[PDB]
């Protein structure tokens, strides 16, 4: 509560928060400069790929076969878009979480990936870059299933991200 003097407040913050939204943004736009357009500074978080699925709980392109890894070159803009290879009892679809420059390595229940795709170049490098059934006897009951992936590169975190390289879902098909 003043008389008259709110100026000396209202004009103050004006060019002091101003100065402060201006240094902060200052420090952001600097940080942002020192990062690659094509590749994050740390890959570590994503380190083992997780496995995710469609369910809810081309041409141009190139024709390819089941081979070893296709190296596109470096991750640079000097070449244009790197070329990508082509690709009752529900149907669940599994994919492997894209991770730039990662080469997967390979060269009872109740009743119930090709290398030529990698390494993934990353969105900026490759836009239309496509990443790569339960025919079961029982019916009309919940079934717990876990699908997992194998490799020396792949690891599972049973205590944590149950996702990591694996799924867990409960299907039911009521006919």
């Amino acid at each position: 509560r003043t008389l008259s003097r709110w100026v000396w407040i209202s004009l103050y913050y004006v060019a002091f928060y101003v100065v402060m939204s201006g240094i902060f943004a200052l420090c952001i736009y600097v940080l942002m400069r020192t990062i690659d357009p094509y590749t994050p500074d740390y890959q570590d978080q994503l380190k083992s790929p997780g496995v995710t699925l469609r369910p809810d709980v081309q041409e141009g392109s190139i024709n390819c076969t089941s081979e070893k890894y296709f190296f596109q070159e470096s991750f640079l803009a000097p070449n244009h878009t790197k070329f990508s290879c082509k690709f009752g009892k529900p149907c669940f679809i599994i994919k492997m979480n894209r991770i730039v420059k990662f080469l997967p390595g390979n060269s009872d229940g109740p009743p119930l990936y090709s290398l030529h795709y990698f390494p993934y170049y990353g969105k900026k490098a490759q836009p239309h870059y496509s990443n790569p059934k339960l025919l079961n006897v029982p019916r009309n009951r919940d079934v717990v299933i876990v699908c997992k992936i194998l490799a020396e590169h792949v690891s599972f975190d049973n205590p944590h991200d149950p996702y990591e390289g694996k799924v867990e879902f409960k299907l039911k098909i009521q006919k």
């Binding site: 990062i35 809810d56 709980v57 991200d161 149950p162 990591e164």
Partner: protein, 993 residues
């Protein structure tokens, strides 16, 4: 209730003996009838005081739990618990979150509770101090025959008989007394015995000889007297009731805190509802808007605060104990820093409460002895031949003796058996002369005529030590006029001289003068007895004057005075510099009280009361403008008559006041008068007569050794040492902390904003939650704690003693300028520091900030194992969560980095880090290191990922907030500079705490 007790008593001493009975229905000789004693017993009640109605059950523990603050934490815990209960509506994560938070809160109230409740569990006790002395039987006369009865049985009207040694059972009207003397210290604070005779000496009942008061003990002699009053009705009984039955009230610090909690709540509500409404306009039902409002609690309420203030108060109290200043209460640490006026009791407080000697007149000159305990003063005279001769009589014509077995203790300190005047002489001689015993031995006392009532003088005949004479020497002392009547010659220097009319008045002059000092005077003379007339053998007759009593050689005069404690005149001065008013309030007589007042600095040079001026002007007083007198001395007998408005004016009117001859109710009256003004008044006292005032004062201070139990109970603080100077230290311990506390509040509060904003942005921006509930508690409970506490170590930016006491109403502990500073400016810089680290971790991960918006539903969506980052990759639920958790960890760390800056800046309000030296505080530096080290531990230590969801941080992550930290240190430092330069205006007005 209490108010009537404050008034002085009115009595019946004027009444005749017969008349008193008539009123009583009693027989003077025979006493009440047995039957009639009973009746009156039922009619009236027992002769017993109403047990101390003081008993606050151990249930009082529960008082520390609530407060106002603990409430804020309670309601907050209760809001969390509700929220949880609302989260019962589905399968929720809160098993780690909301229940954990609400329990943390409750637990901080409880713990803080306990802690407080202990540092206080050490004090109280007052009724039990009083009960410490609690009659037994009385001897009464009923039906003409005396018997000893339980003291409660005594009733108004009966005949009571008391002798030397006994305690007066009840208020009594003295009908008959032989050679009876009483001790009335309970009333007056003064021990010397007082006569009791049947005839009424004065108008005041407290003064008259005819009344003997309960709570008093007949010293010697024998008496009888009619019970005027019993139990609660007696003069002291009223005093009793008028005490314990006191409501302690709130302290200023406690008030300041309460006033803090209001502001804080003020904000926590405003925002918390605002976020109900802002969430409504967004896309949030009554389900969601509501959960946010309550959610907004923790961020708002500093859980760590209560604890910090306490450890800060505790830490300071410890320093003071080191000081020989014990503090019974934590809140007591601060109060001292807001004392305007002190009302001090004189005897035993200001003074040592230890008679002594005074001056001397001989050689036709007035000499001044050293009165001090430590005998700091100098030596008036050894030389004079006259001086010895005088010393001789003082040592020889003297009965007194020092009690056995304290050669350890110093002469003025040791107890002597004998009257006061005779002890004074013994101590005097023993100090400047050497052993008295010596002299006694060496001049063996042949015969002496003890100090008679009729003679008014005491003589002795001694064999002279000088071996060549061992003739007889005659030494006497007594009333100065009497000793002069008895003298022909005067030992001036070595030699005798006729006692002409000239000396007769030079003496008459001294006698007058010393007697004006309010000193008691004694005359001294001696005679070298003619050896012809008195043979070696010669027999003296004490019974009849064998030997010569007249035409003796008048040696000299011996006066006396009174002194205080060494430290006291200074301590008084310090206080006055402090801009504190000191007011003497004593039971004692006015001549003495005024003398000490001068001595101590209560009354300053030049000052003058009406009557002094009066007297220098040579003009009658009516004549004297009152306003010309700065100083005043008011007798209790005059204070009785006056209205409380008249009291207020006297108080307004005079800078140096002395209330003397005041009763305990009057001391209380003065204080109340003081407080009415609205000043904060320290009463310092030693006596039971000080109880109501000590009990009244904003802070009562009592002397530890001398102090009566009563004063000790009644008091908040005890000077174990009886070191008055302590009082000065106590006042200097009530200003450095008050400020240092605001720094710790600003420090703690600032981090609140970095905690709040992430949840808000989370709602507004629809981005993944940047900081978690858990992460917050590590800051408030862990990291911010050492640094906050550490602020207490901080020093003065200026000489603190030099500034005036804070106006409690106008300068609050937490004020809008703090909030604006903590929240508006510094906190805000902190928040961005945290947000940046957030963006850096996600960005690095593959989630650029632009993609972040609107994501939380997908991110949160448990179902989607699929979440595609900007690169185009796919992250499972857990995977992206780990990243988020890393964010929570980095944000946590960003605050600690920005908290380093806040720590530094918070160290000073005005001064530049450079001036102060942020450096000297070792405790603070320790806070930065341990603080960091705690963060690193939370990040690095394995298992901390699961237990507190803290993830390891790359080395890079540590730096993100660095530019933020540094800007804070610069931004503040600039600002203060600005504030130093123009004290007058704007920055200081808005920003200065």
């Amino acid at each position: 209730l209490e108010n009537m007790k404050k008034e002085m008593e009115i009595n019946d001493h004027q009444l005749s003996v017969a008349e008193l009975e008539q009123k009583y229905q009693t027989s003077a000789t025979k006493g009440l009838s047995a039957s009639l004693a009973a009746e009156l017993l039922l009619r009236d009640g027992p002769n017993a005081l109403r047990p101390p109605r003081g008993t606050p059950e151990y249930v009082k523990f529960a008082r520390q739990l609530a407060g106002g603050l603990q409430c804020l934490m309670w309601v907050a815990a209760a809001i969390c618990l509700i929220a949880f209960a609302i989260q019962a509506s589905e399968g929720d994560l809160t098993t780690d979150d909301n229940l954990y938070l609400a329990l943390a809160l409750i637990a901080v109230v409880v713990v803080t509770g306990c802690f407080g409740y202990y540092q206080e569990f050490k004090s109280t006790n007052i009724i039990a101090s009083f009960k410490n002395l609690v009659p037994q039987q009385a001897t009464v006369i009923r039906d003409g025959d005396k018997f000893q009865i339980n003291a409660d049985q005594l009733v108004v009207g009966d005949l009571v008989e008391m002798k030397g040694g006994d305690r007066v059972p009840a208020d009594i009207r003295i009908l008959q007394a032989q050679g009876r003397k009483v001790d009335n210290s309970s009333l007056t604070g003064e021990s010397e015995p007082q006569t009791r005779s049947p005839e009424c000496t004065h108008e005041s009942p407290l003064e008259t000889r005819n009344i003997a008061f309960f709570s008093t003990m007949c010293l010697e002699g024998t008496a009888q007297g009619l019970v005027v009053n019993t139990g609660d009705r007696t003069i002291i009984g009223r005093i009793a009731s008028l005490a314990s039955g006191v409501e302690n009230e709130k302290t200023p610090i406690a008030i300041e805190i309460e006033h803090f909690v209001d502001i804080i709540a003020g904000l926590a509500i405003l925002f918390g509802a605002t976020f109900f409404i802002v969430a409504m306009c967004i896309g949030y039902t009554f389900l969601r808007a509501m959960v946010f409002f309550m959610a907004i609690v923790v961020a708002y309420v500093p859980e760590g605060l209560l604890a910090t203030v306490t450890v800060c108060l505790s830490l300071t109290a410890k320093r003071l104990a080191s000081k020989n200043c014990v503090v019974k209460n934590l809140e007591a640490v601060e109060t001292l820093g807001s004392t305007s006026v002190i009302c001090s009791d004189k005897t035993g407080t200001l003074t040592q409460n230890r008679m002594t000697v005074s001056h001397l007149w001989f050689d036709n000159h007035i000499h001044s002895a050293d009165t001090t305990e430590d005998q700091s003063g100098q030596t008036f005279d050894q030389s004079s031949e006259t001086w010895r001769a005088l010393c001789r009589v003082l040592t020889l014509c003297n009965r007194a003796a020092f009690k056995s077995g304290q050669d350890a203790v110093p002469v003025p300190k040791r107890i002597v058996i004998g009257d006061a005047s005779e002890t004074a002489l013994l101590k005097f001689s023993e100090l400047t002369l050497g052993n008295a015993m010596g002299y006694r031995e060496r001049f063996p006392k042949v015969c002496e005529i003890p100090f008679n009532s009729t003679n008014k003088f005491q003589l002795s005949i001694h064999t002279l030590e000088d071996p060549r004479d061992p003739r007889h020497v005659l030494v006497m002392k007594g009333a100065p006029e009497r000793v002069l009547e008895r003298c022909s010659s005067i030992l001036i220097k070595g030699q005798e001289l006729p006692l002409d009319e000239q000396w007769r008045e030079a003496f008459q002059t001294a006698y007058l003068s010393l007697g004006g000092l309010g000193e008691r005077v004694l005359g001294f003379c001696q005679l070298y007895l003619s050896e012809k007339d008195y043979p070696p053998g010669y027999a003296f007759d004490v019974e009849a004057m064998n030997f010569p009593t007249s035409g003796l050689s008048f040696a000299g005069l011996v006066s006396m005075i009174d002194p205080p404690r060494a430290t006291v005149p200074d301590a008084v001065l310090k206080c006055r510099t402090a801009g504190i008013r000191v007011i003497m309030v004593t039971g004692d007589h006015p001549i003495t009280a005024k003398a000490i007042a001068a001595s101590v600095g209560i009354i300053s040079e030049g000052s003058e009361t009406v009557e002094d001026i009066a007297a220098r002007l040579r003009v009658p007083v009516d004549q004297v403008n009152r306003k010309d007198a700065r100083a005043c001395v008011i007798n209790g007998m005059q204070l009785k008559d006056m209205d409380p408005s008249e009291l207020v004016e006297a108080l307004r009117t005079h800078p140096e006041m002395v209330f003397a001859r005041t009763s305990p109710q009057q001391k209380l009256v003065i204080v109340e008068s003081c407080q009415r003004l609205g000043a904060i008044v320290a009463v310092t006292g030693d006596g039971v007569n000080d109880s109501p005032a000590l009990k009244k004062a904003d802070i009562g201070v009592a002397m530890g050794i001398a102090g009566s139990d009563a004063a000790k109970n009644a008091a908040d603080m005890i000077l174990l040492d009886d070191n008055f100077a302590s009082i000065v230290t106590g006042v200097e311990q009530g200003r450095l902390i008050f400020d240092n506390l605001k720094k710790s509040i600003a420090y703690t509060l600032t981090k609140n904003i970095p905690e709040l904003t992430p949840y808000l942005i989370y709602i507004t921006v629809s981005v993944p939650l940047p900081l978690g509930c858990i992460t917050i508690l590590f800051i408030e409970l862990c990291t911010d704690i050492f640094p906050s506490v550490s602020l207490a170590y901080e020093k003065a930016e200026s000489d603190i003693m030099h500034l005036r006491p804070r106006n409690p109403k106008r300068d609050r502990l937490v004020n809008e300028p703090l909030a604006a500073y903590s929240y508006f400016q510094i906190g805000a810089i902190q928040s961005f520091a945290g947000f940046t680290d957030y963006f850096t971790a996600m960005a690095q991960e593959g989630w650029f900030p632009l993609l972040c918006v609107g994501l939380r539903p997908q991110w949160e969506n448990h179902h989607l194992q699929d979440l595609q980052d900007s690169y185009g990759q796919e992250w499972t639920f857990g995977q992206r969560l780990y990243q988020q958790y890393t964010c929570y960890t980095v944000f946590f760390i960003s605050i600690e980095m920005c908290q380093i800056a806040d720590v530094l800046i918070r160290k000073t309000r005005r001064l530049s880090a450079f001036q102060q030296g942020f450096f000297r505080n070792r405790i603070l530096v320790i806070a930065i290191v341990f603080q960091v080290c705690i963060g690193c531990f939370l990040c690095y230590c394995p298992g901390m990922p699961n237990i507190f969801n803290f993830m390891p941080i790359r080395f890079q992550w540590w730096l993100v907030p660095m530019p933020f930290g540094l800007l804070i240190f610069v931004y503040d430092e600039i600002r203060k500079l600005g504030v130093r330069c123009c004290p007058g205006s704007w920055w200081d007005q808005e920003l200065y705490y």
